Write a protein that binds this DNA or RNA. Structure first.
Lengths: 71, 129, 83, 101, 132, 221, 217, 23
RNA sequence: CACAUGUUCC
RNA sequence: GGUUCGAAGACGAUCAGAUACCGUCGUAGUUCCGACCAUAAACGAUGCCGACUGGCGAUGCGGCGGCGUUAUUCCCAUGACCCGCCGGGCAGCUUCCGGGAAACCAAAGUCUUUGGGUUCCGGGGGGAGUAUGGUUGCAAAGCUGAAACUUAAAGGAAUUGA
């Protein structure tokens, strides 16, 4: 790195501890706020009940009417 | 300021080896430095050296040949055992055809190939290839 | 380059520059052999033998070519030692 | 993308100098950044030099002169057509044009 | 309002190089000389080249031409390049020799010379152009 | 088919006076004729078109596109090279990369690893090559491992006959133009890097121009 | 060359350099020729050592005769000051001349008519002949350049310090070189001086050509 | 110009801080 | 001294 | 205390619209002192110390020596020029040193031939320097500082047309 001593280990991994949070992959897997916001809640499949049907207008040139469902 | 006596010595001679000088002037002379090049005397990588042994930090003038492409300095001085003398050469040396890792031990400053013989590793200095 | 048993396995041995004491690459397009004629000690005329030298292209592109060959020819006695 | 070594200014160790006002406009430019034309000017160009001579006091009276140090900015010098845009190979040529006429 | 192009100039020059001896000075004199020595497609093109043929000899009559290869001029340049002057100005009896050039000769093999003249050193060693 | 010689070293090929192309790369005289490699080692010289890529130029009237082909050449014994050609047609761009690929062959160094028994299988030392932002390294490998590298530099490494290879790269390797030529500098560095085996000073053989200068003025201009 | 009893610095050559103005240098200095300069005289002029001129002439004259074929040795003088000397050396020694207006591509284009592969190159000065030195790094060609105290030493293999500016000083250089290269090869002896005068190689201004012709008539 | 892209957010903050004290 | 703007896909 | 200039604001012209550019004013301000705030494209967009590596012409400080010129003319000695050099001070030209993606740089070089020492700081673009919390300030505001969500792009250098 930038500091190159022999007993700088606390200078080393504390200067690697806090920008691990600025990495998105480490922050996502260790901050539970998105885990709370995960509507699966740690799952992969979920049952659902329909209340209406919603037609979604598509994007820029590739345009159509998309069949979407309120769940 | 001046932190290392051996790192600046190898950087000064590598700055002139790419240029092609035959005689250079290195500002320090340490106990480690004067017997550091004696390893290259037994390996024939650099020509014979003359020093100015005075009441100051002496100046060493070494004869320059082309046999040493680059001598490397590592900072700081990591500890090396014989459970990992094969470990560094996988990332540090070009091969076992040539390339040398030098170490300073209780036997003295000495090479990894002969460190296998006397069975003593330890405090390390650098590598020349 | 020779093997365990002692046979030269390399397909050629590359040249060496005599100034910087380093080898010459296969695609070095500026390396030059200096061909120096031999002068007889009593006749002064051409003999039939040479004192060949070599210079690399990097020394040419900084400008230290002639200073080296003067030093190279001093050791071989071509340049006068009194100077 | 960087265009000059010194970016239109002749400041290398100052950091801060005294601004000066321009001439064509009132543009506030630092002194070592504006173009300083020390224009030399005779009072009458071609017309009255013969006309003063027939109404002067002494024999071959010498005419006085004006010395004003103009300070044009970047936009005011190009609007007065003094400086010119140059190729990047010819930008480094900072020698002044000669004084042939 | 007339410029000789590349086609006219390449046809006119090669005619002069090979057929110098057959050309004259008036335009009409060598105009029909060019008729027999080349295959000219049209009446106009023959008169176009031959004017520039006559235009170049006025350059030749003025003096030598850069882009031409004449055997006679080549021999005349060899006659003047191998011209022999009188005795050399390298071997004189009077030679200006600066004070600082003696001690390099004095420490050499021939210290004392015969036909040399020691000169005065120039007092005041200012030799550089003013700045600006 | 009937070759007319031009270059001075080119005449030396047909006179049966030079034994191999190794003496040319001893003296490193430049090569401009493309049949000399065919003459000596044109038996197993194998061609391969890497890729086609429609590079384009924007013009005032319409659009303007010309192609570009990449070729790795060699026999499976020490000699490989690279060829680059950007031409209008895919046929001429492919042959242009074929025809210049002879002109830029660099002999690689095969060396031993540990014991020196058998055949030289790997790179003698750790060397790298520099061009653009793509980095590549020739790392020695143990016996019987193979060319452990990306598929495009994998092809150029078994293209020379060097078998055990280890690599370590950095950069936008998707630009394989900058990635193939990075190996080219690395393999060319072996004959520029000084070896402790090659501390023996080289006796200077006399140049073939100097050796055969009598014949160089009697059979041509 | 080195301490050779046949090849000392000669008395009859002493008077030629002093009258010509060869030992005088320029106002400035190039960093390369520290060993080739004795001392600085008055009014900013350097002094070029004659012993260094003799020795570097021999090493230059070693390589000329070492190439046993003089038919493939090229000579360049793009400046008009060395024009007259070098042209007739092609006829005398056997060389191939490059006398002004050099064409780029003569060493890389196989289609050009003037496609050459010589063995040795002769340069009157590196500044006017920098373009020939460019292709010297692409094809392996030795060169000689007559260098001043300010001339660059880029892509120059063998260099001889002298004055490449004065008219009387330049034509002395090729004449003495021609007088030497004839001595190593078995054509002309060494005890007797050469019959041909050194004035034959001095470039003459066209002002004096029409003026000396007046003295003839 | 990005200078008043910042100043637009600055007017939003003064408006948003004033409704804090109203409650 | 003024001159602002030319609806989306290719 | 307000000379000049000049936010806000007013008036006269242009505009289809000026709440703008132009001109006439003109308040806070711009000037000084005592208390605040600590933001700038605070830029060399390039942290600090230290060894080495192209020359070249300069300039400034101090020191060394020297033909000579000019004043104290009345010289020793001091000054001003000229020649070099020494440590560094802002610097400048060239470049196949070398680096870089290139523009370019003698450092942005000594970097896969990877480690001289050390501080601050970034991890795709937005959301966002935002919410909240704490803290300084009379205030404007400053410092620290998110998340949900959204996107297959955002961006830098370079070539050619327009």
């Amino acid at each position: 790195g930038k500091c190159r001593g022999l007993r700088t280990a606390r200078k080393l991994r504390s200067h690697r501890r806090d920008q691990k949070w600025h990495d998105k992959q480490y922050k996502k897997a260790h901050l539970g706020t998105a885990l709370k916001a995960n509507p699966f809640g740690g799952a992969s499949h979920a049952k659902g009940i329909v209340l209406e049907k919603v037609g979604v207008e598509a994007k820029q040139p590739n345009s159509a009417i998309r069949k979407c469902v309120r769940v | 300021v001046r932190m290392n006596v051996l790192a600046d010595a190898l950087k000064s001679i590598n700055n002139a080896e790419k240029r092609g000088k035959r005689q250079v002037l290195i500002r320090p002379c340490s106990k480690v430095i004067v017997r550091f090049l004696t390893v290259m005397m037994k390996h024939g990588y650099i020509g014979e050296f003359e020093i100015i042994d005075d009441h100051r930090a002496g100046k060493i003038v070494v004869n320059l040949t082309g046999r040493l492409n680059k001598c490397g300095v590592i900072s700081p001085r990591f500890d090396v055992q014989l459970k990992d003398l094969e470990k560094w050469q996988n990332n540090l040396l070009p091969s076992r055809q040539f390339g040398f890792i030098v170490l300073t031990t209780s036997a003295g400053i000495m090479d990894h190939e002969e460190a296998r013989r006397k069975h003593t590793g330890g405090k390390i200095l650098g590598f020349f290839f | 380059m020779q093997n365990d048993a002692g046979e030269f396995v390399d397909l050629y041995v590359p040249r060496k520059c005599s100034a910087s004491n380093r080898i010459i690459g296969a695609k070095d397009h500026a390396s030059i052999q200096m061909n120096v004629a031999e002068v007889d000690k009593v006749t002064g005329r051409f003999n039939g033998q040479f004192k060949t030298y070599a210079i690399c292209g990097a020394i040419r592109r900084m400008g230290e070519s002639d200073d080296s060959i003067l030093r190279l020819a001093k050791a071989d006695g071509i340049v006068s030692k009194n100077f | 993308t960087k265009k000059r070594r010194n970016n239109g200014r002749a400041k290398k160790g100052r950091g801060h100098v005294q601004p000066i006002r321009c001439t064509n406009c009132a543009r506030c430019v630092p002194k070592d950044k504006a173009i300083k034309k020390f224009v030399i000017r005779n009072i009458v160009e071609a017309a009255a030099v013969r006309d003063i001579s027939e109404a002067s006091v002494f024999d071959a009276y010498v005419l006085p002169k004006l010395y004003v140090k103009l300070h044009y900015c970047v936009s005011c010098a190009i609007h007065s057509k003094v400086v010119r845009n140059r190729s990047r190979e010819a930008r480094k040529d900072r020698t002044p044009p000669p004084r042939f006429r | 309002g007339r410029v000789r192009t590349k086609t006219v100039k390449k046809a006119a020059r090669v005619i002069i190089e090979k057929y110098y001896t057959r050309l004259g000075n008036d335009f009409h004199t060598n105009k029909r000389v060019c008729e027999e020595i080349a295959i000219i497609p049209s009446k106009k093109l023959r008169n176009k080249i031959a004017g520039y043929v006559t235009h170049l000899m006025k350059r030749i009559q003025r003096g030598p031409v850069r882009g031409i290869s004449i055997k006679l001029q080549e021999e005349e340049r060899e006659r003047r390049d191998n011209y022999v002057p009188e005795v050399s100005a390298l071997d004189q009896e009077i030679i200006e020799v600066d004070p600082d050039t003696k001690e390099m000769l004095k420490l050499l093999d021939f210290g004392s010379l015969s036909n040399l003249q020691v000169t005065q050193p120039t007092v005041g060693m200012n030799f550089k152009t003013p700045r600006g | 088919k009937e070759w007319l010689p031009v270059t001075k070293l080119g005449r030396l090929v047909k006179d049966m006076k030079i034994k191999s192309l190794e003496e040319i790369y001893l003296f490193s005289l430049p090569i401009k004729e493309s049949e000399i490699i065919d003459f000596f080692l044109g038996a197993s010289l194998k061609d391969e078109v890497l890729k086609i890529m429609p590079v384009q130029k924007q013009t005032r009237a319409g659009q303007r596109t010309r192609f570009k082909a990449f070729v790795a050449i060699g026999d499976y014994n020490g000699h490989v090279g690279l060829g680059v050609k950007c031409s209008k047609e895919v046929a001429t761009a492919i042959r242009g990369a074929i025809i210049l690929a002879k002109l830029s062959i660099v002999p690689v160094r095969r060396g031993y690893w540990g014991n020196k028994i058998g055949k030289p299988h790997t790179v003698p030392c750790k060397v790298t090559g520099r061009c653009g932002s793509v980095l590549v390294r020739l790392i020695p490998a143990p016996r019987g491992t193979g060319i452990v590298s990306a598929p495009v530099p994998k092809k150029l490494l078994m293209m020379a006959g060097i078998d055990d290879c280890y690599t370590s790269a950095r950069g936008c390797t998707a630009t394989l133009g900058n990635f193939a030529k990075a190996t080219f500098d690395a393999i060319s560095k072996t004959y520029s890097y000084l070896t402790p085996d090659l501390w023996k000073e080289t006796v200077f053989t006399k140049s073939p121009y100097q050796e055969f200068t009598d014949h160089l003025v009697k059979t041509h201009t | 060359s080195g301490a050779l009893d046949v090849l000392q610095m000669k008395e009859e050559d002493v008077l030629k350099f002093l009258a010509a103005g060869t030992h005088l240098g320029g106002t400035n200095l190039d960093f390369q020729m520290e060993q080739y300069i004795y001392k600085r005289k008055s009014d900013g002029i350097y002094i070029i050592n004659l012993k260094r001129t003799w020795e570097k002439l021999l090493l230059a004259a070693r390589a000329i005769v070492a190439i046993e074929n003089p038919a493939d040795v090229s000579v360049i003088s793009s400046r008009n000051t060395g024009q007259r000397a070098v042209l007739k050396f092609a006829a005398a020694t056997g060389a191939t001349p490059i006398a002004g207006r050099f064409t780029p591509g003569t060493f890389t284009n196989q289609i050009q008519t003037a496609f050459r592969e010589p063995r040795l190159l002769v340069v009157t000065d590196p500044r006017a002949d920098h373009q020939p030195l460019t292709e010297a790094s692409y094809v392996n060609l030795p060169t000689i350049a007559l260098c001043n105290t300010d001339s660059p030493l880029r892509y120059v293999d063998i260099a001889i310090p002298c004055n490449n500016k004065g008219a009387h000083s330049v034509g002395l250089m090729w004449w003495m070189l021609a007088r030497e290269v004839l001595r190593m090869r078995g054509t002309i002896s060494r005890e007797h001086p050469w019959e041909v005068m050194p004035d034959l190689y001095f470039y003459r201004d066209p002002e004096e050509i029409e003026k000396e012709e007046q003295a003839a008539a | 110009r990005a200078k008043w892209r910042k100043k637009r957010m600055r007017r939003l903050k003064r408006k948003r801080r004033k409704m804090r004290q109203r409650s």
